[PDB]
Amino acid sequence: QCVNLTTRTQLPPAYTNSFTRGVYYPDKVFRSSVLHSTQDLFLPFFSNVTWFHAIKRFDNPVLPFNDGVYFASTEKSNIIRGWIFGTTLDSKTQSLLIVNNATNVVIKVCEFQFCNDPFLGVMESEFRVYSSANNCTFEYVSQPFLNFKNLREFVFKNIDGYFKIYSKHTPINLVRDLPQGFSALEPLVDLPIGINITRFQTLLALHRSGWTAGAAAYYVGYLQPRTFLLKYNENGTITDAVDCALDPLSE
Amino acid sequence: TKCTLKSFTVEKGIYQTSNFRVQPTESIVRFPNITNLCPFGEVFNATRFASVYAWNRKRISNCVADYSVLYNSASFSTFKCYGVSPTKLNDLCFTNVYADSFVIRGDEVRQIAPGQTGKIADYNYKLPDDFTGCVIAWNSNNLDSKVGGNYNYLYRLFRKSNLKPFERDISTEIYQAGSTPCNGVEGFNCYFPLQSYGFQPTYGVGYQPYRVVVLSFELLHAPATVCGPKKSTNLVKNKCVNFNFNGLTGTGVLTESNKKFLPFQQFGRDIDDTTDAVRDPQTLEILDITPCSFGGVSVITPGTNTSNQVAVLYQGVNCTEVNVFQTRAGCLIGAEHVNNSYECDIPIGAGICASYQSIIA
Amino acid sequence: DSFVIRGDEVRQIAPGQTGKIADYNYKLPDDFTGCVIAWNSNNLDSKVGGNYNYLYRLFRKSNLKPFERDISTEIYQAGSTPCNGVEGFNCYFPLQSYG
Amino acid sequence: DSTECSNLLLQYGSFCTQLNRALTGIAVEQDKNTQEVFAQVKQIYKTPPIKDFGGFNFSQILPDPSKPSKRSPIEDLLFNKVTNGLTVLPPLLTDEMIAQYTSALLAGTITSGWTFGAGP
Amino acid sequence: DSTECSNLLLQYGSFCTQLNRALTGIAVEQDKNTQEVFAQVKQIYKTPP
Amino acid sequence: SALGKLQDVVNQNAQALNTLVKQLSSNFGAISSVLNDILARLDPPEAEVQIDRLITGRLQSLQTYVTQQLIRAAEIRASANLAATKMSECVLGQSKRVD
Amino acid sequence: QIDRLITGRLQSLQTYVTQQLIRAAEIRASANLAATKMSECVLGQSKRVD
Ligand SMILES: *[C@@H]1O[C@H](CO)[C@@H](O[C@@H]2O[C@H](CO)[C@@H](O)[C@H](O)[C@H]2NC(C)=O)[C@H](O)[C@H]1NC(C)=O
Ligand SMILES: *[C@@H]1O[C@H](CO)[C@@H](O[C@@H]2O[C@H](CO)[C@@H](O)[C@H](O)[C@H]2NC(C)=O)[C@H](O)[C@H]1NC(C)=O
Ligand SMILES: *[C@@H]1O[C@H](CO)[C@@H](O)[C@H](O)[C@H]1NC(C)=O
Ligand SMILES: *[C@@H]1O[C@H](CO)[C@@H](O)[C@H](O)[C@H]1NC(C)=O
Ligand SMILES: *[C@@H]1O[C@H](CO)[C@@H](O)[C@H](O)[C@H]1NC(C)=O
Ligand SMILES: *[C@@H]1O[C@H](CO)[C@@H](O)[C@H](O)[C@H]1NC(C)=O
Ligand SMILES: *[C@@H]1O[C@H](CO)[C@@H](O)[C@H](O)[C@H]1NC(C)=O
Ligand SMILES: *[C@@H]1O[C@H](CO)[C@@H](O)[C@H](O)[C@H]1NC(C)=O
Ligand SMILES: *[C@@H]1O[C@H](CO)[C@@H](O)[C@H](O)[C@H]1NC(C)=O
């Protein structure tokens, strides 16, 4: 089942500063009180990240994946539920679906027929994100990952057919923009998908009481190949980082 | 020392002659719990099998497959592999496995083979010439056969062209035996392609129904989700053993660790990026990996003109891991430690010197 | 060292080759010096009814050493069950003839 | 611990012996350097218990009895301010004996002038 | 300027860093040598007219 | 920065050892920097080539380390000879040598 | 085969020349010290202690 949303208000996309966010653990290796220099797909410090709002604003476009995606979410009441990953987003090719419904998180790699406007609806009684599912190759059910009160950071990478999802939950009290601080993203799950992904789309949830969009805001950043100098404390958490290509001092 | 110096006479001094190694005693392989098994119970031992023209294809992926139980079962009358070895199924890894399940006649069991020509091979199930995987077949007279005749299992008898490998044909088009036009109406030379078998309990060997499952392996660029079983052994600590933890191998002494890992971290590295801490996959505990007590073996001797007595210094080696005295330089064997202080004759290290008067340190 | 093999197996009579007769019939060392000679013998080593006089070791527990010959006609145990010198389920003769 | 690697390494000859011998030469050279610098006296001199040197104070350079290491306050400050087949050999002279040699040199140059360097 | 050559050269590790460090050490050592030989006075003396 | 000369010697020695250790993680053109992975993933005819590449790379690294250690040893020996001269002439006597 | 022998022998010769140059530097330093001792101890009386 698909429904066209024809009540949107036209507005240009916003932009903001990444500050020192987007750092994640490059590997599953403990390091104690040491500085490690690593070359990987990292998000540049103080970069220009695209800012989308949900307020009548309902920002669900399809964007190129590039080499990786940094997703920042200033979220309250759990409007953002999942993501759409693929190349052509139709039954011709194979696409990846990430959903978090009221009970669990489901990760599926199948040939889905995506709607032009996919969404959920809130008691949750409205699922309108696909119309068909023909050939499934991989299914994985896991534990649920989840004023703006919650900050959700995610990093998605496609390296050697492995899909790395890094995530971090942060308690914030900032009203509008991204807070300034340091929080290293823990690795959450590695998926053996082995498929081509070039485009993605956020999945939102409607509020029914037409439809109303709950207050949420999210940010999209792009991963670039660069070097980071990570500092590991006594307890083994990354407390500070240096971008080797940002300015000559950090270089 | 004479061998190292290439001389039959050795001058007084200390000569580094060899390299002590603590030989590994045991091999400790720790791999995580063997869970998420592949559903082979519902394919080999299903309630109802499929026909050979519409063979059921089950995809085995994202699981660990225990081929030892399948291979060691004595019920199977035929276990023939054409691209791999039966004893190496538990060691190799594949991207995915295709399981083709069907029932055929006892005489047609040989027809599921590369290069074999038969009715089942040409019209029902075809294998490629470079086929990899294993064909398993077993008798099913006690279950499939019925006293009234089991006609549920159909098979294709006629088709214009031979099958391609891994191709199904469930079409029910009326075959043309001759050249007469047939528009779906049966006639003298137009018959239905699917015929029923005559499985009955009174038939002997060769006409009994045989259940065949064919496993095919894929080795594409996809990750190898399907792997063999992992036989984890017991964990031994405080000894120089060869450790294999989740594919990371090496040699070391595994001791208890006070380092508290975060839940996502598995291995531990020092400044020089060498693994000195690790997490056991079976039980979530942290173990320090101290390198084995390698050292330099030095021989302390006076001149051969004076005496043939020698002492052995194991550099940087504790005396419990090899006239035995423990120094900060290492373990010295063959020298009697005295409390008197003299001038240094042969330097040992860390303030220790050796002399001949027997050899004293 | 004289023997008769198939047409496609002549590449396996070489140093450092991976193969079936390389592992269980005739193994060459990595530092082998000498020459391998192969020529077609369809006119002499073939019969219309089938020349089955040439046999190869289909089954063995382990790969051979270089310049090692195995002529033992003992049964092979392919499974957990012992065979006791008698053919049966998962008990096959190691030597099979070329057709 | 790879036996195949060692078998292939034997084709290259006595490179390992040369590397070990060069490192051994460096290691004995360091001990010889310390011996040349600090062991220039064969008598261990001590200062008198009464530090009556005509008003001259040497407390900052003489060994401190309170410290277990028997180092001077300046030497203690200097030591505080300095922060796979690999082995580190200990030096032949420990820090205590080097401190003892410096103490003997200081006692000789304080109580005896330059006479101890040229004879009794 | 070959990117493929640099990609292959990165497989050999930190040889290039070692060589650059050694040359930098020699370069600063030459300046230290000149400083030690000629800059032994902190006052610029001048002869009388 | 009062004790920079000793700290420089300690830093150079530690950095040299660190560089040596880190040279083990480089494959030097081989498929992997781990000998065990090469021995487990390939047959001995090609594993011999890959191990030979690792051996020559590690041997070159070790020769480089020993050579730079010898050069630093010569520098330290010169400094120690100077220190012994200062010990003999400044501490054990009064020197008329300017500066 | 000759290429393998050439690279091995060339590496051996370069290593030998490298330690020969280092030993030459050490012997040159010792010879400079010996020349200084000949000038100051034999050709004059030295006030330098030891
Ligand atoms: C919502 O709008 C989209 C955009 O027009 C619709 O997608 C098109 O649907 C027609 C229906 O036949 C197709 O012919 C077009 O090819 C579609 N566009 C694209 C780009 O594929 C979509 O069908 C609408 N949803 C519903 C339920 O009508
Ligand atoms: C020699 O110098 C030391 C240090 O300068 C003197 O020790 C000081 O003595 C005064 C008074 O007794 C104390 O207030 C200081 O705290 C002492 N300093 C230290 C570092 O101990 C010492 O008195 C001087 N004279 C003699 C004869 O030793
Ligand atoms: C980010 O991009 C937008 C348009 O692409 C631009 O207007 C804005 O100035 C940029 N911000 C920064 C900090 O460069
Ligand atoms: C992935 O898809 C994009 C477009 O969808 C295509 O240009 C690219 O070649 C594909 N890559 C692979 C490895 O298939
Ligand atoms: C969540 O999704 C799973 C997978 O389809 C489904 O089994 C489950 O019933 C869903 N839960 C709810 C509350 O809809
Ligand atoms: C994909 O689905 C279509 C129809 O749903 C089917 O014809 C095709 O065989 C399927 N392919 C695979 C690889 O499962
Ligand atoms: C490290 O953990 C200890 C608890 O064992 C805690 O007291 C300390 O504050 C932590 N330090 C940091 C920098 O997180
Ligand atoms: C049926 O086959 C499965 C195959 O894995 C096996 O595990 C199971 O024990 C079998 N059941 C019986 C009753 O033989
Ligand atoms: C794995 O098996 C061990 C057996 O002792 C058990 O203690 C443990 O809870 C199991 N699960 C995990 C995740 O280690």
Residue numbers in the entry:
A (entry chain B): 14 to 68, 77 to 143, 153 to 176, 185 to 247, 257 to 298
B (entry chain A): 299 to 620, 641 to 675, 691 to 694
C (entry chain C): 398 to 496
D (entry chain B): 745 to 827, 856 to 892
E (entry chain C): 745 to 793
F (entry chain B): 943 to 1041
G (entry chain A): 992 to 1041
The authors write:
SARS-CoV-2 utilizes a trimeric spike glycoprotein for attachment to the host cell receptor angiotensin-converting enzyme 2 (ACE2) and for the subsequent cell entry step which involves the fusion of host cell and viral membranes. Given the rapidly changing mutational and antigenic landscape of the SARS-CoV-2 spike protein, a structural understanding of spike protein mutational effects and the discovery of broadly neutralizing epitopes is of importance.
To this aim, ectodomains bearing variant spike mutations were used for cryo-EM structural studies. Inspection of the structure of the Alpha variant shows that the A570D and S982A mutations appear to contribute protomer-specific structural effects with implications for RBD positioning. D570 within the “RBD up” protomer uniquely forms a salt bridge with K854 in the adjacent “down RBD” protomer. S982 sits within the hydrogen bonding distance of residues G545 and T547 within adjacent “RBD down” protomers only, and such interactions are not possible with the S982A mutation. Thus, possibilities for the effects of the A570D and S982A mutations include allosteric modulation of RBD conformation through (1) addition of the K852–D570 salt bridge, and (2) loss of stabilizing interactions afforded by S982, in agreement with recent reports. The D1118H mutation within the Alpha variant enables local side chain rearrangements, giving rise to additional interprotomer contacts, via pi-cation interactions between R1091 and H1118 of adjacent protomers, and electrostatic interactions between R1091 and adjacent E1092 residues. Superposition of wild-type and Alpha spike models clearly demonstrates the differential positioning of H1118 compared to D1118, and the resulting movement of adjacent R1091 towards E1092.
